[PDB]
Design a protein around this ligand. Structure first.
Ligand SMILES: *C/C=C(C)/C=C/C=C(C)/C=C/C1=C(C)CCCC1(C)C
Ligand SMILES: CCCCCCCCCCCCCCCCCCCC
Ligand SMILES: CCCCCCCCCCCCCCCCCCCC
Ligand SMILES: CCCCCCCCCCCCCCCCCCCC
Ligand SMILES: CCCCCCCCCCCCCCCCCCCC
Ligand SMILES: CCCCCCCCCCCCCCCCCCCC
Ligand SMILES: CCCCCCCCCCCCCCCCCCCC
Ligand SMILES: CCCCCCCCCCCCCCCCCCCC
Ligand SMILES: CCCCCCCCCCCCCCCCCCCC
Ligand SMILES: CCCCCCCCCCCCCCCCCCCC
Ligand SMILES: CCCCCCCCCCCCCCCCCCCC
Length: 271
C-alpha cells in the first residue's frame, strides 16, 4: 500500500514514479503565472471603475473581489506545489516530501466555492431580465453552484482510492453544472432583448466564453483517465495537463469574463 500518495493523483505520482525536472518546474511556473495574472487583474478592475456609469459598477466591484480571493488562494496553491516535492540526486526526480504538508487541492476548491456565486451573480448587474425574476435567477445560481462545487469536492477525495466513486460524484456535480448552463442561457437571451446590436454581439461572445471556459473544469478533473487506466495521461503528463487547463480556465472565467462584462457596460451607456 502507498500510504503517502493516497489523497490525490498528484501525490500518488510523486510518491511512486516522482516528477521530472521538466514537469515539476513547468507546473511550478504555470501556477505562478496563475496568481500573477489575478494581481494584474485586480489593478485593472480598480482603475477602470471610473469608466462605467454608477448603475453598472457593482460588476467591477465583484470582479475586484474575485481577483483578491483568486490572487491569495492561487498564491497558496502555488507555494503548496513547490514545497511539497523535493529532488533526489540518486534517482534525479522530484518526489513527495514526507516532511512537507503534501499536495492539497483544498486551496483551489475553496477558491471556487467563493468565486462561483459571485461570477454568476455579477452579470445580473449589467443585463436586464425580462420575464424572469432577479431573485429567482440569483437563488438558482447560488444553490446549484454551491452544490456543484461541494459534490465535486467529495468526488476528488476518492480519486486514487475509489475511481468508481470519483466518477459517480463527478457525474452528480455535472448535473448541477448543466442546470447552471440552462439558467445562464435563459439570462443571456432575456438580456439581449431591446439592447443595441453592438451589445447583443458582446453578449453572444460572453455566452461562448462562459460555455467553453466552464466546461474546461470537468475536463481537467478527468484528465489523467482520458486515455484509460494506463495510458499516456495516467502519468506526470496528465498532471501537467490538468494544472495547465485549470490555470487557463481560471484566467478565462474570472479575468476575461470580467473584461467583457465591463466592455458591455460601456457599450450599454452609448444609446
Ligand atoms: C473561477 C473558478 C471557476 C469558475 C470554477 C468553476 C468550476 C466548475 C465549473 C467545476 C465543475 C465540475 C464538474 C462539472 C464535474 C467535476 C467536478 C468539477 C467541480 C470540476
Ligand atoms: C483600458 C486600457 C487597457 C490596457 C491594458 C494593458 C494591460 C497590460 C498587461 C501587462 C503587460
Ligand atoms: C478591452 C479592454 C482592454 C483589455 C485589457 C485587458 C486587461 C487585463 C489585465 C490583466 C492581464 C495581465 C497580462 C500580464 C500578466 C502577467
Ligand atoms: C487604465 C489603463 C489600464 C490599466 C492596466 C491595468 C494594470 C495592468 C498591470 C500590469
Ligand atoms: C472574500 C475576499 C477575500 C478572500 C480571501 C480568501 C481567504 C484567503 C486564504 C489564503 C490562505 C488560506
Ligand atoms: C466545502 C467545499 C469547499 C471545500 C473547502 C476546502 C477548504 C480546504 C482549505 C485549505 C486546505 C489546506 C490546509
Ligand atoms: C455577493 C457575494 C455572495 C457570495 C459571497 C460568498 C460566497 C460563498 C461563501 C460561502
Ligand atoms: C472579438 C472580441 C474578443 C472576444 C474574445 C476575447 C478572448 C480571447 C482571448 C484574449
Ligand atoms: C460535462 C463533462 C465534460 C467533460 C469533457 C471531457 C471530454 C474528453 C474528450 C476526450
Ligand atoms: C478560451 C481559452 C481557450 C483554451 C482552449 C483549450 C486549451 C487546451 C489546452 C490543452 C493542453 C493539453
Ligand atoms: C469587447 C472585445 C474586447 C475583448 C478584450 C479581451 C482581451 C483579454 C486580455 C486579457 C488576457 C490576459 C491573459 C494574459 C496571459 C499571459
Amino acid at each position: 500500500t502507498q500510504e503517502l500518495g493516497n489523497a490525490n493523483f498528484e501525490n500518488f505520482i510523486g510518491a511512486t514514479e516522482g516528477f521530472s525536472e521538466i514537469a515539476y518546474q513547468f507546473t511550478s511556473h504555470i501556477l505562478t503565472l496563475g496568481y500573477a495574472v489575478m494581481l494584474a487583474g485586480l489593478l485593472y478592475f480598480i482603475l477602470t471603475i471610473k469608466n462605467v456609469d454608477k448603475k453598472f459598477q457593482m460588476s467591477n466591484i465583484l470582479s475586484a473581489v474575485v481577483m483578491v480571493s483568486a490572487f491569495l488562494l492561487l498564491y497558496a496553491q502555488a507555494q503548496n506545489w513547490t514545497s511539497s516535492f523535493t529532488f533526489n540526486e540518486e534517482v534525479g526526480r522530484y518526489f513527495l516530501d514526507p516532511s512537507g504538508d503534501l499536495f492539497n487541492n483544498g486551496y483551489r476548491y475553496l477558491n471556487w466555492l467563493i468565486d462561483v456565486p459571485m461570477l454568476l451573480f455579477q452579470i445580473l448587474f449589467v443585463v436586464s431580465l425580462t420575464t424572469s425574476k432577479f431573485s429567482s435567477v440569483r437563488n438558482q445560481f447560488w444553490f446549484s453552484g454551491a452544490m456543484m462545487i461541494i459534490t465535486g469536492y467529495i468526488g476528488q477525495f476518492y480519486e486514487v482510492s475509489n475511481l468508481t466513486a470519483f466518477l459517480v460524484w463527478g457525474a452528480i456535480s455535472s448535473a448541477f453544472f448543466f442546470h447552471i448552463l440552462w439558467v445562464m442561457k435563459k439570462v443571456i437571451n432575456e438580456g439581449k432583448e431591446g439592447i443595441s446590436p453592438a451589445g447583443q454581439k458582446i453578449l453572444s461572445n460572453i455566452w461562448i466564453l462562459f460555455l467553453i471556459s466552464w466546461t474546461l473544469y470537468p475536463g481537467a478533473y478527468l484528465m489523467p483517465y482520458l486515455t484509460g487506466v494506463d495510458g499516456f495521461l495516467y502519468s506526470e503528463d496528465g498532471v501537467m495537463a490538468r494544472q495547465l487547463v485549470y490555470t487557463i480556465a481560471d484566467v478565462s472565467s474570472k479575468v476575461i469574463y470580467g473584461v467583457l462584462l465591463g466592455n458591455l457596460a460601456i457599450t450599454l451607456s452609448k444609446n
